[PDB]
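Why do we bother with holo predictions? Because pocket geometry can differ from the apo form. Keep that in mind while you read this record for flavin mononucleotide.
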Amino acid sequence: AKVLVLYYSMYGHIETMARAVAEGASKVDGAEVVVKRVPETMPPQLFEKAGGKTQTAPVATPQELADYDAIIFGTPTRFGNMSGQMRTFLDQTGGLWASGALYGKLASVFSSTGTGGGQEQTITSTWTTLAHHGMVIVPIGYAAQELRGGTPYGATTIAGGDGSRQPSQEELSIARYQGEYVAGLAVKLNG
Amino acid sequence: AKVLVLYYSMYGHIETMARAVAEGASKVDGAEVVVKRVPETMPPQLFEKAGGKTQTAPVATPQELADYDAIIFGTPTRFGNMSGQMRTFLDQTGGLWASGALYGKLASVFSSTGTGGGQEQTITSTWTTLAHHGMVIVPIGYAAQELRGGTPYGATTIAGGDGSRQPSQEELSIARYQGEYVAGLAVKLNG
Amino acid sequence: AKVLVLYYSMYGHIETMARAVAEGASKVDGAEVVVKRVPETMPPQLFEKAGGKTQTAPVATPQELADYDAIIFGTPTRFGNMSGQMRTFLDQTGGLWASGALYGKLASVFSSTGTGGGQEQTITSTWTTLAHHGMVIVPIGYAAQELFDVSQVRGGTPYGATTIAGGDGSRQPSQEELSIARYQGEYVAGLAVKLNG
Amino acid sequence: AKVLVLYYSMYGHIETMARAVAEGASKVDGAEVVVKRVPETMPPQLFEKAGGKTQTAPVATPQELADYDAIIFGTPTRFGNMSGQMRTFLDQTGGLWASGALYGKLASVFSSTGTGGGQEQTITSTWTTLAHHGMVIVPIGYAAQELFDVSQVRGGTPYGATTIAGGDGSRQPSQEELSIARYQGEYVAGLAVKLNG
Ligand SMILES: Cc1cc2nc3c(=O)[nH]c(=O)nc-3n(C[C@H](O)[C@H](O)[C@H](O)COP(=O)(O)O)c2cc1C
Ligand SMILES: Cc1cc2nc3c(=O)[nH]c(=O)nc-3n(C[C@H](O)[C@H](O)[C@H](O)COP(=O)(O)O)c2cc1C
Ligand SMILES: Cc1cc2nc3c(=O)[nH]c(=O)nc-3n(C[C@H](O)[C@H](O)[C@H](O)COP(=O)(O)O)c2cc1C
Ligand SMILES: Cc1cc2nc3c(=O)[nH]c(=O)nc-3n(C[C@H](O)[C@H](O)[C@H](O)COP(=O)(O)O)c2cc1C
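The structure, written out:
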């Protein structure tokens, strides 16, 4: 019943993706969905230098993850890993891990890429962390709406080597599906 | 409600593990559990030459996987992958994949190792295949009963470089937990 | 100096990719390259029924992998893993493992998919087995533009060369795809010479 | 010839491991080794409150990684990933990536855990980023017994050297663990010389 869409975005691609995930999740009667971001780690100075898109979403604390029934994580792909910002935030969940707060909760991952390559590694290396927390891992498989560079691991979008490309209509429907699919799963379990 | 413990074992370590998984799963009111093995791929001649332990369990077909609500896969670790026997069997599930038979079903993995190393890679590379089938992936986290070389990814046992070592009492309780944990999850969903 | 291109192919895509790899490798003077295949596992009646492709390259034995300075492994992606044929074959390298026969030799991997998903996992999950053998792992990263024999080749495949078969299987490797394969072969054969030489 | 041991450590385990690696590397004549650390990310008031360990090695910049023939990366396992400190640092190598600055250089990885789970994933998920940089990846496999400077060292860590901190963090690297670390350094410094030389 409570679903968190937790994301990191520097140039907006994941932020756009996270809105679509939230929309899908919101289609499920039962699901109370909220979107939050992980803190930006770079000082506003270095962020604006690199051309970053200022993020508006409320900043989540590591501790509040425990309140949710499902968490849908969004990260850009950073050389086949989650972002340093998402990795920093997850590194502050050691107290929750020790308590077993996240144990058995639903987890699912979405990503974005630029030139190309690494999106599958980003998603599956994120799963690893969720597994240490004892979270149930939800891939999208081949549903979805309905597939280019898609993966069964989770919704993705291509930004281009430029970062100019915006998520396509089909990438958004996949992202919506993902939110809706895990939300229904969370309601089935929570309900 | 229907739970399959599907395993490959050459020298018995996984077979022993699979019995423990099945026992745990059988503790859940709701769960109809059955143990089956994947076919041995090597001709009986090469099997007996290598010192193999003849497996008794009924041989599963690739097609019957669809009948189950949760599938718990057991494989030895073979240089950080599932065994060639398990990989061969899973390669015959292309018709099910195309049909989406396994989609959204529960999947969970247990393993064994010898000298040491690779068990985490075995489990997480198996997850990959389950994700392509659209299966919900269930790691054990840090429950379990209650941990040596344990992993949150799934139950494991150490056989030694000799292969003489038998699963410990604690490795069996972890394996039982895993069966019981996913079985309760399958009943929660199926019920 | 001795470079083995070792592959598995059901429908011929990896085969074509393997030939590309070997052609690239042959560009390196003092690199002696051979292309071999792992045994088909399914009975030939079932394989031909499946429309499987019959192939010319010699069937490799596990023991002979000891004989090479570099091995470039080719496998179709099978649900984000190597094929069962390749996995069965590598499951027979236990004796090589015990003796350290493959230790410190160069390894590199290329693959093929129907529709793209899982290629990255196939390659990295193959690297794992190579690391158990203590092989040195050669990713292709995003190489210098001008090292590719076909101009405007795009990045997006850092783990190794890949190709798209189509959901159909009817698609064959593009010159862009085969150029990256050729590059991979030339790059690792160059390294094997620099090392062995 | 130039070998960088680049590490992150909160409580000193990777630091000790890094020194072991560098000691092993120094055995290779013509290998010039430096040990540096990635910047700590948490404010020093919070870091000291946490009982974090203050360290002597110089803080590395992303740009200077271009300057080395081999980089041996050290990170504690953090839920089966590298640390956020290491991930933040590598997230700043985008310019090096664009220029191909790290292309074809040797890379290798070592780690540390509290209770063992996830060490394998930390290393292989670090290899991914190195492959994006087109670095050649050096696993340690299960090396020849007699190459280790401490006798009855056991296999079971093919991806790279690891150590156990205890659930407590109070455990320090055993001589058995540090021997494998030393070996890793000596092995990759040997390769870097053979390549660079
Ligand atoms: C250091 C860093 C690493 C990157 N690694 C990759 C990569 O591995 N593959 C890729 O296609 N794009 C890569 N990119 C591009 C980002 O994935 C792309 O800009 C991102 O998906 C944009 O998402 P965002 O708008 O939400 O920030 C990288 C960018 C940076 C800054
Ligand atoms: C080819 C092959 C590969 C192996 N790879 C590993 C390995 O990566 N790590 C390990 O600890 N043991 C390895 N071993 C040992 C097996 O994992 C061990 O014997 C197995 O867990 C026994 O399970 P079983 O009795 O169910 O066959 C390997 C054995 C073979 C035959
Ligand atoms: C059981 C099996 C699993 C497969 N899994 C995938 C998949 O993970 N992703 C994908 O794009 N294609 C998948 N395919 C398509 C194959 O990758 C395709 O047949 C292969 O690349 C053809 O190469 P080849 O002609 O050398 O055999 C699968 C095919 C089979 C037989
Ligand atoms: C947020 C975080 C996540 C951790 N995850 C794991 C884990 O995945 N497995 C494990 O055995 N230890 C884990 N630990 C323990 C660390 O691996 C341990 O603190 C580290 O190895 C110490 O090395 P260092 O002194 O160089 O920092 C974690 C610690 C923290 C801070």
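The two ends of chain C are 5 Å apart (CA to CA).
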